[PDB]
């Protein structure tokens, strides 16, 4: 029912649009104001915040949210650090998007429940669509 | 079924491994010999070639393969040129990977049959999967 | 007659100066403010705008102008993007300058009506000129 | 009608292909060997030579030719040197392609009979085509 | 007193040279063979290995060592990954060099017992030397 | 005591924060106005200036200050030039941060009084700390 | 007795300094105002002008000067065109500084009375100094 | 009667050519193999080596040669490093080419015996030549 999406890039905004279509509350948060405005018309609540800030994550009660998606791609260090802060925040289910195999290794060990690699994961499905 | 995959990045090598694991024969083509060596381990045939060159594409005999996947990610110019050359060669089905909506629309004008956006489509799937 | 010229390099400023000298109103658009200032002296209206931006083109109202000339030379990606946006904005006649035979074919697929190769066409013209 | 073309870029090859189609003797000279091979199919004679070399220009015997087209654009200094060698060699009429106004004015001062600026001239001609 | 140093950079060699002079056993590990040869004459044992490889760290038996110093600075992801693997290997105390404040924040959350920032730490020491 | 710190990166701002916390008045100079702003918060006086310029250094009156710390790290040329100009200005004591042994030798020849290699000196410090 | 120096770089400023110290009239001309101001203290008259402009060279009675030094190095076209304009203006002796051998060839063919190549000529001079 | 010239630009090859023409035996050293090849035609011995590397200079045995000329022009860092290494190797007389006065002063501090600034010194020489 209630979801949170951190990082509103091309991947993160795509999650927000589909989540809203199924009638679910989505908290879209992004450091960049422009990207938050784009998702403002597609989510229940759009907030400009830095999710690397520990106190900011405390205020945004992410432990209440059923699932939290971290969709930060360019800065590998932010996604790793935001994943950790969400874990101490009490988030039971943490989904993290990783662009590299080395990042996906770190995220697995630090405790991410689901690691998403869009290029590798889309590669497998597109092959399956080609086969059938 | 015989497939041709152009570009051997994260998406291209994932499609080849899935298409070769499913029992199909794949021709992996890339300009980087390092990635061609990686693909040559499991693909039926791997060739180091430039797929924006008309004579080179004629040499690869891409019209024989029923489906041609172009997975050139960073170089949008190379992706569009490869799609154009493959379509002119007489490839029945051309699948192209696109990073943005503008590249996807240009490829639609070029004549690409299926266009895959890894980030957006993976976001849609992640949203559906979180919705269970 | 009203003409819109996008890109104010050596070719674009020559078209504007020739078009305006004949009594036609020209709109000169470029991202480089120096060349927009240089054209503003003799051009009916000069605007500093990015014509690959689809919302910006709607503001320019390029659908009103009878012919739109896109004279972006160095940036081929910007050339195809501007042609695509102009066609999607409902421009009846789009003339595009192309620096290569591969760019010209992509522009033909996009929907450009007249494509000018400055080096090749001027070569043919001077070859005819020397003969006669 | 006997012609010589120096520099076999896009412009030079276009002058060679139009001149040969009209049915006149053309000498194509270019420092780069594969461009000479490309032009050899069309022109009567294609020679790989350096036209900034005084003795080479003397051996080419360019004073016989009715018109000499110097189509070197990338390096302005090579085009200037070759115009003077040609004019010292005794060529009656020398046509030179210039990419910049500074190059065009230098070539006018040194004695080029015809200076071709493909961007400006094609700009004027394209504007005239747009008018009618 | 038995020590291990991972990463034979300028910081790593300085630790290795000072440790051996006192009379304690030092294991020097670096992915690059050239740097391992440099410390081969300055440590008890110098091994070329990849310390982000989980099985390799097990073979090295780093849990026997009293202290391990991870001195990988150029690639932030390797230092984080090596720190986690060392902690999982059972090492009691792990000293990690961090070049950036963002890296040091992650390493503290990971569990590194001592984070060394050479620019910040030497900045304080140098100032105190200026005082007296 | 009056101190002058040139370059306000990690080392330079750490020396200034320590010097001012110890009750000393420090001058912070940097070409990056962004970093001069953080220093100006806690530094007695902060100036945006280029310290490789002789007239600029004469304007700063660095000869008044007891010690001049030059903490230009990435640009070794700027570090050498700043040390040379400071010595020619007439400053009694110059402390220079050097990231290379060769740079340290060149600075010794120039006339620097104390040269700090943060990586190597921090390595020695850390080794001594682990030993005891 | 009376000299003119065009271009006030490192070479031209040295020419002006030596010429004025010897006791002669020197008209120092440079398009850049900073260098003209720098040479204003030394030379009899320092003028900011573009010597590529033909009317400016006509206004500056360079034909009255015994010798004219053209010391433009970076832009070869500027030096060639300034030499041509000075020769057309009636200057009997024109000394031109050339940085490359192709530029020297062009200047020799144009008609410059003296071509100065500082690196080669000092190469010979310091070789002779080393020998004796 | 034995000289070593480091760097084989226009200045370095001119010193070599003159030194070998006067009967002396020159060792030409450069990192660019093309210039070492062109110098090897007339110099006594030519070596492709990096002269900023301490062990390489020891292999070259530069202490044997009475005079060592360092003609590295573009890379000021390489010029300073080569001068330092040659001086610490035990070369009695080191001549260095310097582009600017700041590099010249740094080289004076390093220990260079003769410093040649080609532009300024040719300015002085040409001024004296025009005077009488
Ligand atoms: N600390 C952060 N807190 C919140 N959002 C962030 C943070 N760091 C990055 N983001 C956002 O995460 C998104 C991921 O985008 P990314 O793929 O990294 O770059 P790009 O937008 O260039 O493709 C961006 O919209 C970015 O603003
Ligand atoms: N003209 C071309 N012909 C064939 N392959 C190409 C061409 N241009 C790029 N490629 C390949 O396409 C692949 C796509 O790589 P890229 O998307 O840049 O990296 P990644 O997939 O790791 O993000 C590259 O490995 C590159 O070698
Ligand atoms: N996205 C864009 N929108 C509008 N104008 C552009 C865009 N990209 C490039 N231009 C303009 O097109 C002009 C022609 O480009 P170019 O061929 O590089 O210059 P020139 O024709 O003088 O060599 C440039 O002056 C540039 O400012
Ligand atoms: N010294 C020379 N003698 C003869 N031909 C030359 C010389 N220098 C250059 N050329 C030729 O002139 C041509 C100029 O073409 P250019 O405008 O550079 O085409 P492009 O811009 O596509 O490289 C080149 O193909 C080159 O081979
Ligand atoms: N996975 C790894 N396992 C072991 N050692 C590594 C690994 N990755 C990097 N290193 C080593 O860590 C050292 C850190 O060196 P660093 O000081 O960052 O290099 P630089 O001086 O070029 O910045 C490197 O010499 C490298 O060889
Ligand atoms: N000429 C100069 N005068 C003053 N400050 C300079 C000059 N050149 C560089 N700096 C500054 O000196 C500092 C050197 O630190 P640097 O190593 O570049 O960054 P960091 O230590 O943060 O990694 C930077 O703040 C840089 O902008
Ligand atoms: N058209 C011109 N008229 C007069 N002076 C010029 C002209 N073009 C360039 N100059 C001057 O000639 C000087 C020589 O330039 P250059 O050889 O590049 O010296 P530097 O490398 O120190 O800039 C430049 O400082 C420039 O100001
Ligand atoms: N570390 C080095 N060791 C030896 N030779 C060098 C080194 N660095 C540069 N050189 C050489 O010094 C020569 C002079 O440099 P440069 O001034 O760029 O050439 P030019 O005199 O043609 O402008 C170059 O040809 C270069 O190959
Ligand atoms: Mg994005
Ligand atoms: Mg990819
Ligand atoms: Mg143009
Ligand atoms: Mg060409
Ligand atoms: Mg290091
Ligand atoms: Mg620093
Ligand atoms: Mg200069
Ligand atoms: Mg030189």
Swiss-Prot record, chains A, B, C, D, E, F, G, H:
GO molecular function terms attached to this record: ATP binding; monoatomic cation transmembrane transporter activity
Subcellular location: Cell inner membrane
Included range, full protein: 6 to 137 of 220
Domain of life: Bacteria
Predominant localisation class: membrane
Entry membrane topology: Peripheral membrane protein
UniProt keyword list: ATP-binding, Cell inner membrane, Cell membrane, Ion transport, Membrane, Nucleotide-binding, Potassium, Potassium transport, Transport
Keyword flag Disulfide bond: no
Activity regulation info: Requires both ATP and a high membrane potential for activity. Binding of ATP causes a conformational change in KtrA, which promotes formation of the KtrAB complex. Can also bind, with lower affinity, other nucleotides such as NADH or NAD(+), but only ATP can induce a conformational change.
Record text on subunit structure and interactions: The uptake system is composed of KtrA and KtrB.
Residue span(s) of domain RCK N-terminal: 1-116
GO CC terms of this entry: plasma membrane
Source organism per UniProt: Vibrio alginolyticus
Binding site for ATP: 10, 30-32, 50-51, 72-74, 97-99, 119
Gene name in the database record: ktrA
Job of this protein: Part of the Na(+)-dependent high affinity K(+) uptake system KtrAB. KtrA is the regulatory subunit and plays an important role in the substrate specificity and transport mechanism of the system. Binds ATP but lacks ATPase activity.
GO biological process terms held by the UniProt record: potassium ion transport
Protein name in the entry: Ktr system potassium uptake protein A
Family in the record: Belongs to the KtrA potassium transport family.
